[PDB]
Write a protein that binds this ligand. Structure first.
Ligand SMILES: O=C(O)c1cc(C(=O)O)c2c(n1)C(=O)C(=O)c1cc(C(=O)O)[nH]c1-2
Ligand SMILES: O=C(O)c1cc(C(=O)O)c2c(n1)C(=O)C(=O)c1cc(C(=O)O)[nH]c1-2
Lengths: 249, 595, 595, 249
């Protein structure tokens, strides 16, 4: 047999050479199950995987996805992760919560688009002091019909160079760059109990699992049996990348 | 000025954008009339050396012609006796990072002229896209002073033409798509120091309102609406930049202009009324205090922009009372006329009978009547929104005939479909967006994507149109009217057309190297009348040809709408000058040769 | 072909570069003459969309107009009834790395047309400087076959026009400055297969010499000189590329062309005679065997090149015997005439009396007489050495009048200064080079840097000039001659000029957007005669405009000599078409209008 | 007092910041002198420094110039070096001199312009197979007015990657990149006594010294006397850089 995986070029999770974390996980699970893995490439970014990869019957499975997603059926969870605070060390500047007053005297902050961090910036009252900077992190291009996002390399580089005092990022996305950074940095988990002024409850830590189509049910059994088989290799690889991991509740 | 008006009266000069302070583009020359139009053939031409869109018109003062360019913002001065020789040139050095902040294309819209007093010589005023303002000597070509008004790093671009009033020069701003707060600045023309500066949103101290603001019409708004109509500190990034044309009146000592759209593009993120955005302002010149302001589209949701041209006139109303008026077309399909002294509204009419975003405009209260079916924020697909985001009018410069009392204008024929969508992602991340499509209207041909323009003659007081005629693509540009029964315009096909004032029949058409997006101008040198026009295609409709794009949805849908422009024209740029029988300076071949 | 000649007989077509197989550039139209030339005004014009040099002339066949362009070598087709519409267009794409291997500018010469038998339709043949040859269908525009000829990695670029003979196409080569060994190739036009290939240097097998090579003139050289004249294996990197024009004779079934300069530039590194470089060749078509060859400038040391145009004629010599002649101008200031059949030398005269590099040319032997004072390798500053590297003639296409028996030519007036130097360095390392300067000749003004061109009428057998006139800049380009006493040409200033045939007086001049480095053409469509010409500056003289340089010693000194061209013209590119009184397809303004 | 020495941008010998070998030598010499060192910079390459700087009294002395040079007075030499062959250690292509026949079968070789290596290439009849490659190393632009040369870093990269099997280069120009090369590259000195086809003597080992203007005779003696105090620092600098010093004998 064989395995077909829905793939898109998105560093550092998935790369053309196959050296990314997601590609390694897919190859390891395919080897554990005993079927070869074929990596079909879709030109569009990852957000378009479900609409044009699975509904078009071109590919079969997505290596990483959010749990409890109503669009497609999802397998059993296998790792959790959250958002992290990135700070530049040897500045006696320690940040542990969004309620700390010192966050309002920082010159700039780096946070992605369409992210709860942006909502937090709007809540604390500093979005108007960082809009131009955020549009300058990437070139001043952001069409309303196309998806744009700041890559982790720019974020970590601007944190290291001292232009931005503190950053808020996703765990698995920024592990390699901070690990290999020449300037020593500091990563701290964000508390999962975040209180909004209005009262909305949106968490900061999420489960992740891979999914298949709605009609198929045997594929889910094969996938989660293989995932049960390949627990220690996956855990060892994850510890090799050094990403922060939280226990499953 | 007390000297620029007299220069404007003479027929040998073209001193300012609009040819005068009323901005009517009217000449009093009759040597080219309906008797002799078939003999209009070119006299001479020049090439700039650039490949983008060329906008605006040249300047002709005291036997010299001044020409401006596209992105490098070069300037050329030529003598009318021997055009082939360049008297002086100015080529600046600029960071090639300002191309990443331009919204639509690298364009400029003209130059300014100051005659000067006895001590200081005459000056030429120029703006650069980096955000610099400079003054050059009109006879030699050095620099007297140079300052900066916009910052590239924040995202502020400057593509508007300077405008000279008395002893001061007025500068605008652009870049509202990036969320840039708009402002207007006045500078001393001799040294370069700043005199006053005004904003569009914020506390009343920054707006510089007078103590009698809107006293005749209290229902427009009086005070405290620059922050109250917004929620929170949104007005710091609200927008409202002006990049259009000005008007000036010496009797009232007032400057009239308009303001652009607010930011961001999503109407949900900015809930309120968004006051003093898309507003007609009449302000003072010496101190900059505002005298009146009227709102056209409160809380816009279709991405319009009210920065079009305004034209002053004097006419008798329905009751028979003589009044001084300003007329203003808009992108939403309504043309307004207002009283120049106090700001009362006289009439508001529909450009075409296929507009379905507004049913009517109420004159007593000033509030338009909306049609819910053809509006956005409907949470699903919306069809047949006429006009589109391009609108029925744009940065062109229409014309006015006072003896007949008619307005000659060019109108687009474009309609839009809007499709909102939301896509989830991994960790609480969602992407909200809109897909926009444009297509020809009901009176065109949707199957073959042709029939996207019109030209009309209009009367404001009565409201009826004398005549209207159809075109292939939109008239992205202006018109110009002469004394003897004639109007001129250009087309993106690469044509210069001359029409009839009282019947509209086609009389003359000629082919130029590339399509034109400027407006024609005319002058006299020695008993001979010349008509000059730029050529070179660009702008919003030409975005698909400049950057070689094939996606129909690129440029909000402009690539799909103008997909047939490639098999009719290509790029270029330069100036062409026509005369009767093509007679010009080189009639004797022994002028301008070596030895 | 047996259809191409008959097509050329008709006066509605211009089917090949040169208008016929003799490269005479002569028409037989008398509608435009000395009586009515002052009434000539433009009819219509086009802009292509690229800013570089433009060489060659367009083609007009079967009621359609075919137009080419410089890098990236696009092609367009147009209809004469409605010029505005573009029937089909072709836009190739190739590696941008080809920009850095061209010597002088990114240019091209022309296209070719093949009428077709019953099975295979008509074809258009084109070349691309990445080293590619392509054929397209003349009606639809689809591609039939595409082959590769050169290698960019070694430094070979293809900027020559194709040439169609019978059922075959001939292709040359370029890139001699970098050490490329030149060659000529023949291909089939229906399929694209290779038939024969010939080389300039090397053994006789590569030379393709017939059994009777130079039988009538043994003193020119017979056998073994491909490798005998060189020392060692230098002929592998010798040079000899051909990038000019060809001529064909069906009676003798021969093609005549020339060969380029040797490499490297230093004459001390290649001792010997360097045979079969800078040689006039007459070869066969089907087999390619060389019928005869004649060398002009043995052991070159001034960087000349024998790639100029060759014309064919029939004339009576001094003895009164009718003979068939080929005439060839050269860069060193000598014009040659030869017998087509056997290659006997008839005469060789001087282009100007200011030439001091050769005293005279011996007709009995064929060896020029040199002056040691005005040569190189003297190890000291040598001054006033002209004709210079640019020479008194270059790639232009001159004209011949069959009736008057005169040649109309354009000449340059430049003189140069040579200074060698050697610089030591750290560890047994030294660098050897030369510094070159250029300036106007004795007949111009060295201080003001003007007076660098001439236009002349010449007779071969008699050897006297009927008239000669001088201009401001060099006449880079060619000439076109008509039946009634007119000669047309173009100028770098941006002028089209028409002169008199029997007196030399100036009759007409017009200002086009930019200068011309091609030659004009004329034709007829419906009882009306049209004159078309390209515009756009470039080539060797315009280097300072294109790459924006300022050092006077750059470009082998060409920047300093043309320092005044910046304030007379700018860039551009396109085509313009003139007619009497400016009448054309748009006289009735309802043609080409929507609906 | 100020030394006021002339410098040019010739990597790796001299850089703007001041980390070039000549800069270290000059700074140590000046520190031994007792006076601060001053730099005067010309935009032209180093080959012009003697003609434009020293003879026009803009600067005072040069850093490195060959001894017994008729142009200017030369100080006592402080080190000696010569040309070296560079090859890959894995390929087992050992070259001892120009008389090895195996150099004929090699596909490509890299040498400089105007060097004795080009003369050796012309003596063995391989120039026609390498002219195009040499002209393609630098961009295809070698005008007869200006001075052009191949970057040493490009030469080392080309020999290491595999385009050219054998290289010939001068020691101090490529020593730094030879030391810090990930690929195992081996180098070997060229024999001093080499005969061309005609039999003319052409050496391969040269001394190096410091040059002064002809008029300045007191400074020459002073520098000669006060340079004798600092052999060990110069020796340590050469050892740290890695230049193959050949003792004078
Ligand atoms: O908000 C802005 O700053 C801004 C600037 C410009 C501009 O500078 O051209 C245009 C617009 N908006 C705009 O919405 C628009 O329709 C438009 C058309 C053109 C053009 O050159 O054809 N510019 C602009
Ligand atoms: O040796 C060559 O391959 C070669 C090519 C070309 C060329 O193709 O333009 C020129 C020359 N040489 C040359 O010597 C020269 O003066 C020259 C002028 C021009 C021009 O287009 O004006 N090309 C060339």
């Amino acid at each position: 047999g064989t395995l077909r995986v829905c793939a898109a070029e998105q560093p550092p999770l998935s790369m053309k050479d196959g050296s990314g974390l997601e590609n390694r996980i897919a190859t390891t699970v395919a080897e554990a199950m005993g079927r070869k893995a074929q990596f079909v490439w879709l030109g569009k970014p990852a957000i378009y995987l479900v609409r044009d990869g699975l509904e078009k019957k071109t590919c079969d499975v997505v290596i990483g996805l959010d749990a409890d997603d109503p669009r497609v059926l999802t397998s059993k969870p296998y790792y959790r992760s959250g958002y992290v605070f990135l700070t530049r060390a040897d500045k006696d500047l320690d940040i542990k919560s969004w309620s700390d007053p010192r966050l309002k005297e920082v010159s700039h902050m780096v946070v992605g688009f369409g992210t709860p961090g942006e909502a937090m910036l709007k809540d604390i009252g500093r979005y108007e002091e960082d809009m131009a900077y955020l549009y300058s992190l990437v070139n001043f291009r952001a069409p309303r019909n196309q998806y744009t996002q700041i890559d982790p390399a720019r974020m970590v580089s601007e944190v290291a160079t001292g232009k931005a005092e503190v950053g808020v990022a996703f765990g698995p996305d920024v592990a390699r760059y901070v690990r290999d950074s020449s300037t020593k940095l500091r990563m701290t988990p964000v508390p999962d109990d975040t209180q909004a002024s209005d009262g909305r409850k949106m968490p900061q830590s999420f489960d992740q699992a891979m999914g298949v189509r709605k009609d198929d049910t045997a594929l889910k059994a094969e996938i989660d049996a293989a995932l049960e088989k390949a627990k220690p290799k996956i855990e060892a690889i994850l510890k090799e990348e050094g990403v922060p991991v939280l226990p499953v509740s | 000025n007390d000297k620029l008006v007299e220069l404007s009266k003479s027929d040998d000069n073209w001193v300012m954008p609009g040819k005068n302070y009323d901005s009517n583009n009217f000449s009093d020359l009759k040597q080219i009339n309906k008797g002799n139009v078939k003999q209009l053939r070119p006299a001479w031409t020049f090439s700039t050396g650039l490949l983008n869109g060329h906008e605006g018109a040249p300047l002709v003062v005291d036997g010299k012609m001044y020409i401006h360019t596209s992105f490098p913002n070069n300037t050329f001065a030529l003598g009318l006796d021997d055009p082939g020789t360049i008297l002086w040139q100015d080529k600046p050095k600029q960071n090639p990072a300002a191309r990443a902040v331009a919204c639509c294309d690298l364009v400029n819209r003209g130059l300014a002229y100051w005659p000067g007093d006895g001590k200081t010589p005459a000056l030429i005023l120029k703006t650069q896209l980096d955000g610099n303002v400079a003054a050059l000597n009109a006879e030699t070509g050095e620099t007297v002073w140079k300052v900066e008004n916009s910052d590239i790093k924040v995202g502020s671009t400057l593509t508007i033409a300077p405008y000279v009033v008395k002893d001061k020069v007025i500068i605008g701003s652009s870049g509202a798509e990036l969320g840039v707060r708009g402002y207007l600045t006045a500078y001393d023309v001799k040294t370069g120091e700043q005199v006053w500066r005004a904003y569009a949103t914020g506390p009343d101290k920054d707006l510089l309102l007078a103590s009698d603001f809107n006293i005749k019409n209290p229902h427009y708004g009086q005070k405290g609406l620059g922050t109250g109509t917004w929620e929170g500190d949104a007005w710091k990034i609200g927008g409202g930049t002006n990049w259009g044309w000005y008007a000036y009146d010496p009797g009232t000592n007032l400057i009239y202009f308009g303001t652009g759209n607010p930011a961001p593009w999503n109407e949900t993120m900015r809930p309120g009324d968004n006051k003093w955005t898309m507003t007609i302002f009449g302000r003072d010149a010496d101190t900059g205090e505002a005298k009146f302001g009227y709102q056209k589209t409160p809380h816009d949701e279709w991405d319009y922009a009210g920065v079009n041209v305004m034209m002053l006139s004097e006419q008798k109303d329905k009751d028979g009372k003589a009044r001084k008026l300003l007329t203003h077309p808009d992108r939403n399909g309504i043309v307004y006329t207002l009283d120049r002294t106090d700001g009362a509204l006289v009439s508001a009419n529909k450009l075409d009978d296929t507009v379905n975003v507004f049913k009517s405009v109420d004159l007593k209260t000033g509030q338009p009547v909306r049609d819910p079916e053809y509006g956005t924020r409907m949470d699903h697909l919306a069809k047949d929104i006429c006009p589109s985001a391009m609108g029925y009018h744009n940065q062109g410069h229409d014309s006015y005939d006072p003896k007949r009392e008619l307005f000659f204008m060019g109108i687009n024929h474009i309609c839009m479909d809007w499709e909102p969508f939301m896509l989830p992602y991994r960790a609480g991340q969602f992407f909200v967006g809109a897909t926009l499509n444009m297509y020809p209207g009901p009176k065109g041909d949707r199957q073959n994507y042709e029939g996207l323009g019109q030209i009309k003659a209009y009367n404001a007081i009565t409201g009826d149109y004398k005549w209207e005629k159809m075109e292939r693509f939109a008239v992205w540009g202006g018109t110009m009217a002469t004394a003897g029964d004639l109007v001129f315009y250009g087309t993106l096909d690469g044509y210069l057309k001359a029409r009839d004032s009282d019947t509209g029949d086609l009389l003359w058409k000629f082919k130029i190297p590339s399509g034109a997006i400027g407006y024609p101008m005319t002058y006299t040198h020695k008993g001979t009348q010349y008509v000059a026009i730029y050529y070179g295609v660009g702008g919003w409709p030409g975005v698909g040809l400049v950057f070689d794009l094939a996606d129909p949805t690129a440029g909000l849908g402009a690539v799909g709408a103008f997909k047939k422009l490639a098999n009719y024209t290509q790029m270029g740029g330069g100036v062409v000058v026509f005369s009767l029988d093509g007679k010009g300076p080189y009639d004797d071949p022994n002028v301008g040769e070596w030895k």
